[PDB]
């Protein structure tokens, strides 16, 4: 179960590895947010209790959860 690198980028040398878990992705999204975000962050967690009212982090399991610069504005 393998994330990409993160932030700016397509590539480097990857894996969230020994345990535990999930590619913990912060995404700003001001409200609304209509065409808004352009904010990654991520540096892995052990656990999924990020799920709350004014967050950002949601947990990021399964694969590469990783988007882009969201902005494919489209």
């Amino acid at each position: 179960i393998v994330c990409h690198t993160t932030a700016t980028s397509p590539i480097s040398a990857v894996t969230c590895p020994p345990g535990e878990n999930l590619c913990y992705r912060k995404m700003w999204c001001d409200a609304f947010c209509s065409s808004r975000g352009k904010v990654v962050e991520l540096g892995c967690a052990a656990t999924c209790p990020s799920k709350k009212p004014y967050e950002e982090v949601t947990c990021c399991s399964t694969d590469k959860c990783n988007p882009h610069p969201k902005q494919r504005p489209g």
Binding site: A7, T8, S9, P10, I11, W28, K38, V39, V40, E41, P67, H68, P69, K70, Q71
Partner: peptide, 18 residues
């Protein structure tokens, strides 16, 4: 003065491979 800002926080303008 200033130092300072900066953004954000954007994934804008990748990395690049090339």
């Amino acid at each position: 003065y200033r130092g300072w800002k900066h953004w954000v926080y954007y994934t804008c303008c990748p990395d690049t491979p090339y």
